[PDB]
Amino acid sequence: AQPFAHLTINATDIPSGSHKVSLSSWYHDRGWAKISNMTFSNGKLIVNQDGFYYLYANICFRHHETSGDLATEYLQLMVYVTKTSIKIPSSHTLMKGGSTKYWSGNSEFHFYSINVGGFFKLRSGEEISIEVSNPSLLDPDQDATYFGAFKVRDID
Amino acid sequence: AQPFAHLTINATDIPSGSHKVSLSSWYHDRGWAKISNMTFSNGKLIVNQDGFYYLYANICFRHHETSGDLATEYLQLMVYVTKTSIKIPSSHTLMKGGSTKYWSGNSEFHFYSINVGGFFKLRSGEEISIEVSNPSLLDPDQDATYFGAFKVRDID
Amino acid sequence: AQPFAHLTINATDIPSGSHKVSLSSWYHDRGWAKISNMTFSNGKLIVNQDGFYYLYANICFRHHETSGDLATEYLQLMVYVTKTSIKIPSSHTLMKGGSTKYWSGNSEFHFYSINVGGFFKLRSGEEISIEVSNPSLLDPDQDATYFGAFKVRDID
Amino acid sequence: PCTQERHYEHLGRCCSRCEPGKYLSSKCTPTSDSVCLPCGPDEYLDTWNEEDKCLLHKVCDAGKALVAVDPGNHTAPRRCACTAGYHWNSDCECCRRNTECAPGFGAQHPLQLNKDTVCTPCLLGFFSDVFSSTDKCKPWTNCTLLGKLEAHQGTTESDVVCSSSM
Amino acid sequence: PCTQERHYEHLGRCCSRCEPGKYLSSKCTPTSDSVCLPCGPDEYLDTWNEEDKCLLHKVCDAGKALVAVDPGNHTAPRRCACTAGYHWNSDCECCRRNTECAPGFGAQHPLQLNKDTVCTPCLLGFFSDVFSSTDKCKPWTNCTLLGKLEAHQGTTESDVVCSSSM
Amino acid sequence: PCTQERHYEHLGRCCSRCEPGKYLSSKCTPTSDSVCLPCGPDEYLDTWNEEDKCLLHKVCDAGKALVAVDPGNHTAPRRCACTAGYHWNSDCECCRRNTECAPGFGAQHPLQLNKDTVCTPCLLGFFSDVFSSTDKCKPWTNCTLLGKLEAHQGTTESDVVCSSSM
Ligand SMILES: [Cl-]
Ligand SMILES: [Cl-]
Ligand SMILES: [Cl-]
Ligand SMILES: [Cl-]
Ligand SMILES: [Cl-]
Ligand SMILES: [Cl-]
Ligand SMILES: [Cl-]
Ligand SMILES: [Cl-]
Ligand SMILES: [Cl-]
Ligand SMILES: [Cl-]
Ligand SMILES: [Cl-]
Ligand SMILES: [Cl-]
Ligand SMILES: [Cl-]
Ligand SMILES: [Cl-]
Ligand SMILES: [Cl-]
Ligand SMILES: [Cl-]
Ligand SMILES: [Cl-]
Ligand SMILES: [Cl-]
Ligand SMILES: [Cl-]
Ligand SMILES: [Cl-]
Ligand SMILES: [Cl-]
Ligand SMILES: [Cl-]
Ligand code: NA
Ligand code: NA
Ligand code: NA
């Protein structure tokens, strides 16, 4: 069957505030957003078929001055790609990326992107989710903020 | 057939100036540059065979002080991976990355790299191109500035 | 057979000091670290089976103030993914990434991650290694500092 | 023999393309013509097309100082503009701060949305004593309104000076 | 009819899960029950599980101002804490500098490890003249110890003033 | 029984390796020996090899303050050097600013290309009053040339002082 997903941020429903959250709203079937033989449900990408997948994420952060002063100009912009299952209550991080930044009020616009990618063993019923540090800084563009997976080989 | 391309910047022909351009010169058959069952023509990587491909790009920017003061020390270093077809005149962005930077004249050298990657549905005759923000800052090294694609599965 | 490796940093054995080194200690069989039909030996990932592989690396750098002042606050944080063979004595760089940074003593913590990825032709007996600029700044986490490879197709 | 537009050739037969608002679900077969289906919510195609799927409307991100001037539909793209005091810059793909006109210069009016300020030198009898991206040249004060006489004349950079005699 | 915990169903039969410290090497077959093997070095599982493999203990990175309070084992996770003067922050996942109490305020005691300073206003007869994340309010000087008299009384922000008469 | 260099074993037979400037197009078969083809434009191999393909010459990027000292060819690698005032640094893989010698110290001559300045203390009768990565110690002024007498002697950090008598 050879499953895959390319999920892009749901611009309609990005969380507000500046505490780290678990991102649960993504498009699955519009623009470049697509999914086959995996399911997206309850804010999680669910693996349907055992296999080794390549997982990836691109996350973009932005701030313009018309949004007013930042709470602090000292930022740590992070992405965490985490795994859990419908069974176990806890989740564990697979990949991680980001950078501390200084975004001065002197400049009118700021931008930064994180990309992570990795090859992981996945089982039916396991669930991937994206956590980010500053929800309100997220770039709503489909070419900016996305994550995905595609099966590369069987478990055997 | 299972097509692929790994294209590295054509150090012989990097555009000058500091306005955003479409990069149309890349090696296809020297060093790590390679291509099979895709074509590179008129500055575009042309898809020959339908399929789902993983697309990626690594772009490096650099500046040394012997090149003289930057126009401005406030930079926004960006990459845009765009798609068009021999048919339609317009193009649309698939992936996007970069960061605003402050490159002070105090330090003699500055460096920054962007990496993006993504899984996309592609049809025969569709054309991928790379756009970057500061052509004259591009690192001419083959291990620094490149992009590629490889087919992972059929459309079905 | 379809070989692969996902290698994570050996937190037990990260080199000290601030000169660029070749990283030779990685887990191969614990947590997310895994390997099949490739070998890890003498600090190198050895290709066993000819093919085109996708190679990737995520490298994280960090510094906290309780470790004392940095030698200099002007950093260039780099990763080099290099290739050699049991035959030839010299090695050549395939991919490259990083950024110059200014990590002021004003802030208590600093963080930065590099990701590179690329599609390369590899032969039995060829050896991949990771070189980094500031060994003592490396993040020991398995989700932070890793590299890997998976075969995508035959040479033919 | 197919018309270049509105028609396309496949399997050696002439097939009709999809109208704007619709995408090509499946190409013509030997037994039927093209199957064209409407674009999904917030999607569009603006031409007579042979497209695999529809395009998603761009986001007029308020977080980028953007606002929609035209919302778009299944037939037309959404159009955005930089909000007041900013203009679009295609190098940063961002909403840049508008250029300030120096003293002795004023902002050309009427002020265009999404377009950068144009600066003109102040004409005789007018002046500008500020850096501003919005302000035009203001006219010199007329001293009679103040019940005073003109002491010395103004410039293009400074105002007239009024004084009361005795 | 399987017990929700300690048991799992597979191939229509009831199979025993793996005890903490062990992972599921292979599921029960028609001929045998589950095969459960011990976790590898520095690995663990803390529940009755059906897991493919064991979890690796987190690193209490000294480079992050972290130290282990509980080392963990094959049965339990390792526990880390921010070293003195720092507290864990779940937004940065980092060891943040503890909040300083202003003058007129002192640090609540006893001081908790890995937890941020709590600031209380100084009570009458006590004062604090510094920003400090550690210092509580100190009591006013008693002038008799200095062989002097109280000139003027202190505040919550400043100390008493002693003077020698004649 | 194959010679370790210039020869390689394959299919149990002794096969000749490719000469520098050529790569191994295809290994020896049961019917023929190795097929070795010349390196492509701007490519090279410097040893007797069994290589899949040739290496691409490094770029002596002027943008990195680099310049070629040896252009290389199909047989030899290209060699680069940092331009004047800079030296190669293998930690940054970049052209670093040369170390300045303090006052009382001069730059060792002759100055090496691509190598950092070495600083030596000035010898008696010589001085240096600047931070410079290029300047050696200059000799004290001789007052007779100025038609004057030596008032006070110089140091390694400052020059002699000349005065006119009467
Ligand atoms: Cl959707
Ligand atoms: Cl960065
Ligand atoms: Cl920083
Ligand atoms: Cl600015
Ligand atoms: Cl895994
Ligand atoms: Cl080429
Ligand atoms: Cl910035
Ligand atoms: Cl410096
Ligand atoms: Cl797509
Ligand atoms: Cl291991
Ligand atoms: Cl920098
Ligand atoms: Cl701070
Ligand atoms: Cl290659
Ligand atoms: Cl649009
Ligand atoms: Cl946009
Ligand atoms: Cl502008
Ligand atoms: Cl743990
Ligand atoms: Cl941690
Ligand atoms: Cl805090
Ligand atoms: Cl070379
Ligand atoms: Cl180089
Ligand atoms: Cl140096
Ligand atoms: Na003005
Ligand atoms: Na205090
Ligand atoms: Na000197």
Author numbering:
A (entry chain A), B (entry chain A), C (entry chain A): 162 to 317
D (entry chain R), E (entry chain R), F (entry chain R): 34 to 199
From the paper:
RANKL (the receptor activator of the nuclear factor kappa-B ligand, also named as TNFRSF11, TRANCE and ODF) and its receptor RANK (the receptor activator of the nuclear factor kappa-B) are essential for the development and activation of osteoclasts, and therefore play important roles in regulating bone remodeling. RANKL is a member of the tumor necrosis factor (TNF) cytokine family and was cloned by four different groups. The functional receptor for RANKL, RANK, is a member of the TNF receptor (TNFR) family. When interaction with the ligands, three separated RANK extracellular regions bind along the clefts formed between neighboring monomers of a RANKL homotrimer, leading to the assembly of three RANK cytoplasmic regions.
A crystal of mRANK/mRANKL was crushed and seeded into a solution containing purified mRANK and hRANKL and crystals were obtained. The crystals diffracted to 2.8 Å using synchrotron radiation and the structure of the complex was determined using molecular replacement with an initial model of mRANKL-mRANK29. The final refined model contains residues of 35–199 of mRANK and 162–317 of hRANKL. Similar to the complexes of mRANKL-mRANK and other classical TNF-TNFR family members, hRANKL and mRANK form a biological hetero-hexameric complex with one receptor binding along each of the three clefts between neighboring monomers of the ligand homotrimer. The 90% identity of RANKL ectodomain (residues 162–317 of hRANKL and residues 161–316 of mRANKL) between Homo sapiens and Mus musculus indicates, there is no significant structural difference between the hRANKL-mRANK and mRANKL-mRANK complexes. The critical residues in mRANKL involved in the mRANKL-mRANK interactions such as His-179, Lys-180, Gly-191, Arg-222, Glu-225, Asn-266, Glu-268, Lys-281, Arg-283, Asp-299 and Asp-301 are all conserved in hRANKL and make similar interactions to mRANK. For the hRANKL-mRANK complex, the corresponding residues (Arg-223 and Asp-300) in hRANKL form similar salt bridges with Asp-94 and Lys-97 in mRANK, indicating its important role in hRANKL-mRANK interaction. Considering the important roles of Arg223 and Asp300, a set of hRANKL mutants, including Arg223Ala (223 M), Asp300Ala (300 M) and Arg223Ala plus Asp300Ala (223 + 300 M) were generated to screen for hRANKL mutants that lack osteoclast-stimulating activity. Biacore analyses showed that hRANKL has a comparable binding affinity for mRANK (Kd 1.56 × 10−10 M) to mRANKL (Kd of 6.8 × 10−11 M). Mutants 223 M and 300 M exhibited 20-fold and 70-fold decreased affinity mRANK while the double mutant 223 + 300 M exhibited a larger, 260-fold, decrease in Kd.
